[PDB]
Design a protein around this ligand. Structure first.
Ligand SMILES: CNC(=O)c1cc2cccnc2s1
Length: 118
């Protein structure tokens, strides 16, 4: 149907917009602290602490699979990255401070993405 095609076109362009947003957000993490899943080899008990792990690479995989239906779902995943980090790591760590900076600096980027979506 033309309708299903039209939807897939919207979804494809949403994916295109979110891809840009993802690249911008990841630029706010120059140290690549949030680039990959927390290694269960380097941190074997992590899953006892964090029930829903998230990272930029995992977000990217979902993105290219067009697994984000709207911005809210995308923001959910970004928020997990930040919130997980700030629970697992203590306040006076390079990890926690990185999350804070990503949170603050990403707020700008998501504020406009929200408008560009409507
Ligand atoms: C988002 N990444 C984290 O919260 C990490 C925490 C720790 C702790 C020790 C060694 N490596 C890592 S990575």
């Amino acid at each position: 149907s033309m309708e299903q095609v039209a939807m897939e076109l919207r979804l494809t362009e949403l994916t295109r917009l979110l891809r840009s947003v993802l690249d911008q957000l990841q630029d706010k993490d120059p140290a690549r602290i949030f680039a990959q899943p927390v290694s269960l080899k380097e941190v074997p008990d992590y899953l006892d602490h964090i029930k829903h792990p998230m990272d930029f690479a995992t977000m990217r995989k979902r993105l290219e699979a067009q697994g984000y239906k709207n911005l809210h779902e995308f923001e959910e995943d970004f928020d997990l990255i930040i919130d997980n980090c700030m629970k697992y790591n203590a306040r006076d760590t390079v990890f926690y401070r990185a999350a804070v900076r990503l949170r603050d600096q990403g707020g700008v980027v998501l504020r406009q993405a929200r408008r560009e979506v409507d």
